[PDB]
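User: Earlier you gave me the apo prediction for this protein. Now I'd like the version with adenosine-5'-triphosphate bound, so I can compare the two side by side. Same sequence as before, with the ligand SMILES added.
Assistant: Got it. Here's the input I'm using:
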Amino acid sequence: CPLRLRSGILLYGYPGCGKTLLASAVAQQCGLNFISVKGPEILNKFIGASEQNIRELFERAQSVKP
Amino acid sequence: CPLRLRSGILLYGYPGCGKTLLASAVAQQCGLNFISVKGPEILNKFIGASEQNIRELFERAQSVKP
Amino acid sequence: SVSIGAPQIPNVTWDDIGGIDFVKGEILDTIDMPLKHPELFTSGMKKRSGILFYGPPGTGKTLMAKAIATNFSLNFFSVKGPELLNMYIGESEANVRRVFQKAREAKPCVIFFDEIDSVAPKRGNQGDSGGVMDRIVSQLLAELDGMSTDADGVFVIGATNRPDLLDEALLRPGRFDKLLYLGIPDTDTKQLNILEALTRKFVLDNDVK
Ligand SMILES: Nc1ncnc2c1ncn2[C@@H]1O[C@H](COP(=O)(O)OP(=O)(O)OP(=O)(O)O)[C@@H](O)[C@H]1O
Ligand SMILES: Nc1ncnc2c1ncn2[C@@H]1O[C@H](COP(=O)(O)OP(=O)(O)OP(=O)(O)O)[C@@H](O)[C@H]1O
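And here is the structure of the complex with adenosine-5'-triphosphate:
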């Protein structure tokens, strides 16, 4: 395949609509390294740290298999 | 004359009017030690070095000829 | 570069993107004309500061920069604006100074700031909460203004989507001279070229028209 395949997809819907459950389940349904992070956890009152945490999470991602 | 001569003058004007050049150039014309400084170089994230940075700049300045 | 770091260039060339017809001349003149004609151009005069992009997002600006770097094969580094900002002022300025001076050590080279908008805004416009950026932007200015004096073989490129917020001190020639554009393709020929480049590698059936 000569074109980079669509990799990222967003989710959005009603509250408590199982989006969390679907995200949890897709880890085993296919079987991969499921890196998980919340919204606030990345953000920290120390400037730089908020972007730094996401950057190092992506470093971890590049570290391992898909 | 037992009077301290006028030695400090400020530069301002329209942006990109040439002040940077004239500043750099006058050194060779008069002939002196032009210890150029970069604004962000002085300020240091860490206390106890900013004042130290400016002090070292001044010690450099005096330690050389006018 | 590996010893120095950034291998960023994955894969790109002119065939990999379209709509470069009009920009080709200006970018090539800014980049390679001195490369092919340096000694002739050695007249001790102001070199072209660099390049500045803008327009709708997704217009291929970053792909365009990567293609420039790969095709002309000059040392490249990608600076993601937010990655610079540290918890407090100063150390970000130190980071900017060290990156620029190490680039000035690796000469000739190409340098590009990705989304300059988020690290070079109009300070004062947005609610100044801490005034942190005021000083970081200051960094770039002088180190951009100090490039032409000695740093020959290094040139700057910028990518923007909301250029209405860029600090004006940058826009001055010497700081920035070529405000290049990359937007929506107007005429069917633009999209035709962009598409034949888009499907250049496709294994298409003859039914494709
Ligand atoms: N008569 C002149 N003498 C010197 N420079 C001139 C003259 N006329 C035009 N210029 C040009 O004005 C330009 C302004 O550049 P310079 O960076 O020195 O400006 P500035 O107003 O001091 O800006 P900044 O404060 O942002 O550094 C110079 O590059 C120079 O070539
Ligand atoms: N001929 C083409 N010109 C430009 N983009 C193209 C072309 N063909 C395909 N594309 C697609 O357009 C997108 C270009 O996005 P690019 O990575 O250059 O972001 P950008 O517009 O510089 O980013 P931003 O505006 O967010 O700063 C990619 O998804 C690429 O696949």
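For your comparison, keep in mind: The pocket of adenosine-5'-triphosphate (ligand 2) is lined by residues C 17-19, 57-63, 115, 159, 161, 194, 197-198 (CB under 6 Å).
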